[PDB]
Amino acid sequence: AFDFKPFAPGYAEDPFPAIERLREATPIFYWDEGRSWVLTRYHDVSAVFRDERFAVSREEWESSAEYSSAIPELSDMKKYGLFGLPPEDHARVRKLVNPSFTSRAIDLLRAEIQRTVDQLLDARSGQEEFDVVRDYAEGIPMRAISALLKVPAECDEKFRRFGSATARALGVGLVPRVDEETKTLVASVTEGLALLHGVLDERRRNPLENDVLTMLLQAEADGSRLSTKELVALVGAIIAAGTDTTIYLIAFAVLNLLRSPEALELVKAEPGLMRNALDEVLRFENILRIGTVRFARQDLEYCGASIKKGEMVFLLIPSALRDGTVFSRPDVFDVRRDTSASLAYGRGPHVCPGVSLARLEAEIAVGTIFRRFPEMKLKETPVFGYHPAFRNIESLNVILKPS
Ligand code: HEM
Numbered sequence: 351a352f353d354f355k356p357f358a359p360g361y362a363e364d365p366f367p368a369i370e371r372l373r374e375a376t377p378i379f380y381w382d383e384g385r386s387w388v389l390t391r392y393h394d395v396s397a398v399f400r401d402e403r404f405a406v407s408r409e410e411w412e413s414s415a416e417y418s419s420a421i422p423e424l425s426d427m428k429k430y431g432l433f434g435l436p437p438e439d440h441a442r443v444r445k446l447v448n449p450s451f452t453s454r455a456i457d458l459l460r461a462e463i464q465r466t467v468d469q470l471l472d473a474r475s476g477q478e479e480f481d482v483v484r485d486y487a488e489g490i491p492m493r494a495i496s497a498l499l500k501v502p503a504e505c506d507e508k509f510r511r512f513g514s515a516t517a518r519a520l521g522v523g524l525v526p527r528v529d530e531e532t533k534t535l536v537a538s539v540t541e542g543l544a545l546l547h548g549v550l551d552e553r554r555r556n557p558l559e560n561d562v563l564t565m566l567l568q569a570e571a572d573g574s575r576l577s578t579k580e581l582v583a584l585v586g587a588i589i590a591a592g593t594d595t596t597i598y599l600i601a602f603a604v605l606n607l608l609r610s611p612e613a614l615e616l617v618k619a620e621p622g623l624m625r626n627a628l629d630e631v632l633r634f635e636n637i638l639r640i641g642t643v644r645f646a647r648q649d650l651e652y653c654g655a656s657i658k659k660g661e662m663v664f665l666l667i668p669s670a671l672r673d674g675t676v677f678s679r680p681d682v683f684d685v686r687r688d689t690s691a692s693l694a695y696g697r698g699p700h701v702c703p704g705v706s707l708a709r710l711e712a713e714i715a716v717g718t719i720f721r722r723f724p725e726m727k728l729k730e731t732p733v734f735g736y737h738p739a740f741r742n743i744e745s746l747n748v749i750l751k752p753s
């Protein structure tokens with residue numbers, strides 16, 4: 351049950367020695383600063399995802415009151431968003447939007463994503479320094495979500511800001527060390543919600559064929575299928591959930607291929623392996639700092655612990671995914687392995703709706719960059735930060751065509 355310090359300097363860069371220590375010594379421990387139990391092993395993590403004794407709604411938490419008062423601008427999003435809705439409401443909302451996120455539906459986005467990837471590399475690949483985060487990955491995910499929502503590129507920076515702020519603001523009162531000023535967070539959240547109201551009112555005015563937002567609006571207008579608050583919360587969550595995560599995937603992919611020349615040469619030789627490799631990036635080195643949370647609906651015993659009702663539980667994803675009893679050679683980056691058991695996109699009713707979008711964006715972004723600059727080399731050690739949810743890479747400086 352030893353030493354868990356996920357905000358220590360060095361942890362985001364390389365958390366694996368620390369959490370192997372934890373995982374090898376115990377399946378469960380109490381994280382005093384996080385005020386919650388932490389589960390360290392694959393099977394325990396996997397099960398809790400599907401186990402209905404554990405809720406997602408933060409309203410089940412013993413500290414619900416404190417959490418709901420924090421960032422009142424986000425109260426609606428917390429009550430009516432995908433995490434807060436009761437299971438039958440959650441199923442309903444998911445049944446509605448899931449069709450818009452399949453591989454086939456998101457395939458339409460392919461040309462716009464490639465165009466964005468093309469102009470980012472055109473506009474900045476000429477200087478000495480190329481920052482894979484600042485100059486590349488950062489400009490991609492919002493373009494994608496905005497194409498899916500049919501929002502003009504001029505609004506991209508406002509929504510990205512909103513997405514990233516919202517993801518952090520939702521941590522305030524929930525997770526220990528949100529690394530930003532409230533007033534700044536709150537302003538980006540406010541402005542973003544305003545922008546969103548305008549996007550939605552325009553779409554109701556000018557509804558479109560084969561369009562996610564119009565479909566959601568048309569469901570809201572007809573007999574009870576989606577409330578206005580559910581709808582707004584849903585679009586807001588999609589923007590916030592899909593912004594930073596994908597930035598980190600793309601960056602961690604490039605990093606991990608630069609670090610493993612063998613893996614890269616394999617993906618060069620069989621471009622069809624790119625999809626598996628991107629899944630193995632998340633498996634071998636998951637972008638999450640700690641993981642995700644659940645809340646005990648009732649007192650119960652679990653892996654030798656007496657968990658009380660309302661107590662929070664963290665699933666230590668990056669640990670579970672190095673669990674040697676499920677993955678062979680868990681500590682090797684192997685782009686040929688079977689990655690089916692990866693929990694990186696969740697399991698159960700709350701399984702990530704954006705998985706096909708994240709994979710498409712990253713295949714295009716990571717594929718393109720290595721095809722057009724095959725001899726790319728890391729110019730320096732990646733700089734990591736203190737995002738409360740993510741092992742966030744702030745910069746990843748490389749040399750595209752090295753002398
Ligand atoms: C590689 C990037 C991504 C990762 C690793 C990821 C991971 C996850 C995970 C693990 C969950 C479940 C969390 C839990 O059960 O507590 C989830 C839920 C979610 N993800 Fe993703 N996601 C990613 C990208 C995206 C994108 C691009 C979108 C765009 C819409 C998205 C939208 C969502 C939403 C809305 C939920 C809530 C689902 C629900 O509660 O029903 N994600 N994601």
Ligand SMILES: C/C1=C/C[C@@H](/C(C)=C/c2csc(C)n2)OC(=O)C[C@H](O)C(C)(C)C(=O)[C@H](C)[C@@H](O)[C@@H](C)CCC1
Binds near residue numbers: 432434587
């Ligand atoms: C990868 C990941 C992204 C989901 C995204 C988010 C805010 C989703 C969502 C749906 S409805 C709603 C209000 N939000 O959530 C995030 O990007 C970060 C979370 O907002 C905060 C609350 C900061 C966290 O640390 C949590 C515990 C985070 O690590 C878990 C939830 C991450 C796995 C899911």
